[PDB]
Design a protein around this ligand. Structure first.
Ligand code: NA
Ligand code: NA
Ligand code: NA
Ligand code: NA
Ligand code: NA
Lengths: 211, 211
């Protein structure tokens, strides 16, 4: 959840906002080790419930998100239902555990290519066009992230938007992402320059990947 | 309905068959002018009911069809229900009225393209990959007619099969069609040549379209 003024600026200038819980367990092996652990549900539930209690009155918040990159566990199921029960006025989404779990109302993958399937075990990232019509599937698709704008990039962007426009149940996505996370450093002649990972003596680091 | 032997052979040689009532009113304006008329319900009925009575016992008949190019009228609906009621063992498909009406278990377009939409007024021909994912659509897709094999033809046949194989609910189709409907005539030398429409002083005709 963002600094509180953000939602007010969003209400007033007019942007649709996904308000996202402060839960990310990307580093766990497997990604759900904590989110499937009932000992961790209290700590998780606070982070989800307290966002709603704070943010439920902002018109700009149209979708509640259960967190990010934390696999899929019974805790996610539990909190989804809490949100549905507490705030029926908003769909809940979550990318974790396959992007189409019992825990999301929107098929919201990250980096699911337009035409090409990527048949990863357990968590396949289908081609968005194919994903919609998987047997027994009905929900809409909006990529919670797509088109990694890292360095010289965004090549193949027009292909998403052509598909967005043709398929009525494809309803867009959120680009990864807005701003470069470079931090100003200064040199010997007192001159600024943009620095990434490991430029602070920090290690292990994932270098230019913050940008 | 075919010569009775056709089914005996399809039983013994192993082919899945679509048995299809003898009803096409293609040339009516609009196409359903009779199939919607309750006074044609008796004559239509017999063509559907007397097929089911004759052919119900053949294992090669896996799907009943209500006819061809006769729009969509209340009679189709009446008769679709009759079969569904008398033979639950086989699904009913019908293409009239935009290929996805209430009188078909199978979305069965004719000449629907893989990727390109043909948004005809009232009866559009969506791309087959798009058709399946349309809001609230659940049914399988199997084109009753595709890849028109007239003359040097069948360009882009590969595009259709990569599609079927990629999309689980794209379950193939029936090519149009098996055999050139040409007839033998004889010249001054008693030598045999292939004739099409027009070649019998028959007029009006649709020329080589019979092939
Ligand atoms: Na769309
Ligand atoms: Na990054
Ligand atoms: Na298939
Ligand atoms: Na003519
Ligand atoms: Na023809």
């Amino acid at each position: 959840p963002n600094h509180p003024l953000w939602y007010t600026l969003c209400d007033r200038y007019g942007l649709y906002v996904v308000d996202e819980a402060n839960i990310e367990t990307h580093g766990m092996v497997p990604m759900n080790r904590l989110t499937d652990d009932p000992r961790w549900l209290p700590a998780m539930s606070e982070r989800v419930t307290r966002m709603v209690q704070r943010d439920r009155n902002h018109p700009s918040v149209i979708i509640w998100s259960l967190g990010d990159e934390s696999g899929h566990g019974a805790n996610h199921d539990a909190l989804y239902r809490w949100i549905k029960s507490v705030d029926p006025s908003r769909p809940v989404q979550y990318e974790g555990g396959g992007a189409d779990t019992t825990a999301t109302d929107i098929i919201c993958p990250m980096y699911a290519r337009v035409d090409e399937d990527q048949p990863f075990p357990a968590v396949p990232k289908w081609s968005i066009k194919k994903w919609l019509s998987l047997p027994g599937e009905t929900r809409p698709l909006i990529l919670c992230e797509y088109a990694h704008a890292m360095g010289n990039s965004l090549g193949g962007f027009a292909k998403y938007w052509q598909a967005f426009r043709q398929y009525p149940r494809l309803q867009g996505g959120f680009v990864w992402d807005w701003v470069d996370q470079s931090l100003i450093k200064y040199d010997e002649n007192g001159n600024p320059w943009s620095a990434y990972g490991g430029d602070f003596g920090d290690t292990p680091n994932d270098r230019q990947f913050c940008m």
